[PDB]
Structure formats: C-alpha cells, structure tokens
Amino acid sequence: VFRVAVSSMISPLETMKGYGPVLSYIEQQTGRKVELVQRRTYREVNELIRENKIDLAFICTYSFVEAELFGARPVAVPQVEGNPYYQAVVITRRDSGINSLEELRNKRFAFTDPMSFSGHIALRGELVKVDRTPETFFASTFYTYSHDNSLRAVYDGIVDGATIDSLVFRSSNILYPEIGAALQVVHVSPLVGAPPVVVSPGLSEEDYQLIRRAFLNMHNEPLGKQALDTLFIDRFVMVNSGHYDYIREIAGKI
C-alpha cells in the first residue's frame, strides 16, 4: 500500500475541489493501492513524515523548510502560468473601506495554520517591518485551518481581512465568481517556491525515483492531465530549495 498524506479538510470526493484523480494517477503509475492519510494540521503531517508513517506528502512551504532538515526528499513543485512559485495575498471586501494592510490595524484577522507560510508566517514577516506582532497590530486573530474558510470569513464579514495562498485565491475565483467579484487583494508577500511534494526519509530510493518521474511527467499522461485540472495547475517541475530562502529568513526573526 502507498500512503499519501495531505494537510487538508477537502475530501478527495468533493464535487468542486476533489483531488481523487491525483490519487488514481499515483495508483496507475506506481501499480500500488494508494491510502490517503488526511490530517487537519501541518504539524500532524510533518510528524507522520518524521516517523516514516507515510510514503508521499503534499506539504506547505514552511513545513518543507522543517521537513527537509529531518530527511524529507523533494519530488516536485506545481507550476501555474510558467511559474513554480506563489505568495501570500491579504484579502478584504471591496465594500469594507479597508484598502491596505495598515488599514487592518485594530481589525479582526484570519490565519489558516500556525505552520502555513501564505496563511500565517508571511504576514508575521510583514509586521516585523513595522516592529509589531499580529497580537499588537490586529484587534483579534484566529486559525481557520482552511484557506477556503478564511476566504468565506472575509466574504461574510466575520473577519475584516485574511492572509491566504495566492493559488487558492486563483482557484477559488475560477470556481466561485463571487470571490473575484466582492474581494480585493490589498497586500502581497515576497515570492517563494510553491508548496512541494516530498517522500518520507525512509522510502526506498527505487520508489522515490519512480514517484519523481510520475510527477514530472504528469502533464504527459491523460489521467495526469485530469489530476492537474482538479489541482488547478499546469504541470509539476523540479524543486529548487533556494526558492524557500525568504521563509528561512522570516523564521530566524520569529
């Protein structure tokens, strides 16, 4: 059995963003039965990787910085419009009268996961530049553990702003026209490498090299093209560890 970990509450069978076809592609290319190992938090997934309880993991960019150091081996990174990179976007309602990050001082703010770059760490990085923390900048903060729920909370006026994954913002806009319609990007982070796919430290070298070829050729296989449409990406390309140097810089400054 081939164990694939995701940090996501999205079902592989979801009508809208179901990634089941990604799992079918991995079955076809590895000739293994795939077992999905789904967890709410990034920390749970990194612990599974650290303990070799899984074979393959879709992890986040901050999680990767930590996971690389305990031997997680990089497979590939998604590419959208020729770009294997993304950024944090700070989102408000167009009708909020909140048109910049400075206008979110003393407002309610949503994070996703404490270990998310686009959902937490990027924004903590921006606030270092004005010598603040989220605790002394915003009126309140919250962890949604969901880029989609952070989006919905800004939409409903539950929070005044949120920081989310630019790729989720893009995909959300394709699936839910209201998002592009009612929400605005008021601030962005620096660019970093997109969220990578890794194997466990323990996975055999033979299996690792098989998976690497499967991901880097996904755009060449009909079931692979189906999988890429469910993930809203063009293809996978090789990981460049240097593309996460900014995340490493933020981490040191806390």
Q: Where are the domains of the chain?
A: 2-80+195-242, 88-189
Give CA–CA dist 11/31, Å, rounded.
23
Stated resolution in angstroms: 1.8
Amino acid letter, residue 186:
V
- Shortest CA distance to 230 belongs to which of 3, 19, 6? 19
Amino acid letter, residue 161:
G
Residue 178 is inside which H or E element, if any?
helix 177-182
What is the torsional sign of CA 156, 185, 123, 167?
A: positive
Give CA–CA dist 100/81, Å, rounded.
27
Q: Check: CB of residue 75 under 8 Å from CB of residue 237.
A: no
Q: Check: CB of residue 76 under 8 Å from CB of residue 120.
A: no
Beta strand pairing status for 2-7 and 34-39? parallel
Two structure tokens written together for 232: 């809203």
2-80+195-242 matches 88-189 in fold: yes
The DSSP symbol for 106 reads T
- Shortest CA distance to 92 belongs to which of 7, 17, 155, 144? 155
What are the two backbone dihedrals, phi and then psi, of residue 99, each rounded to the nearest 5 degrees?
Answer: -120, 10
245 HSE (CA, 13 A, CB side): 3
The DSSP symbol for 172 reads H
Under 8 Å CB-to-CB from 213, ≥6 apart: which residues? none
CA distances from 34 to 19, 54, 60, 74, 106 (A): 13, 11, 21, 19, 46
Domain 88-189, CATH among 3.40.50.2300, 3.40.50.2020, 3.30.1360.120, 3.40.190.10: 3.40.190.10
Indicate the CATH number for domain 2-80+195-242.
Answer: 3.40.190.10
Give CA–CA dist 42/46, Å, rounded.
6
Using only C-alpha atoms, the chain has a radius of gyration, in whole angstroms, of 18
Under 8 Å CB-to-CB from 81, ≥6 apart: which residues? 234
Q: Check: CB of residue 58 under 8 Å from CB of residue 230.
A: no
Tell me if residue 93 falls in helix, strand or coil. strand
Q: Tokens 């033979």 — which residue? A: 206
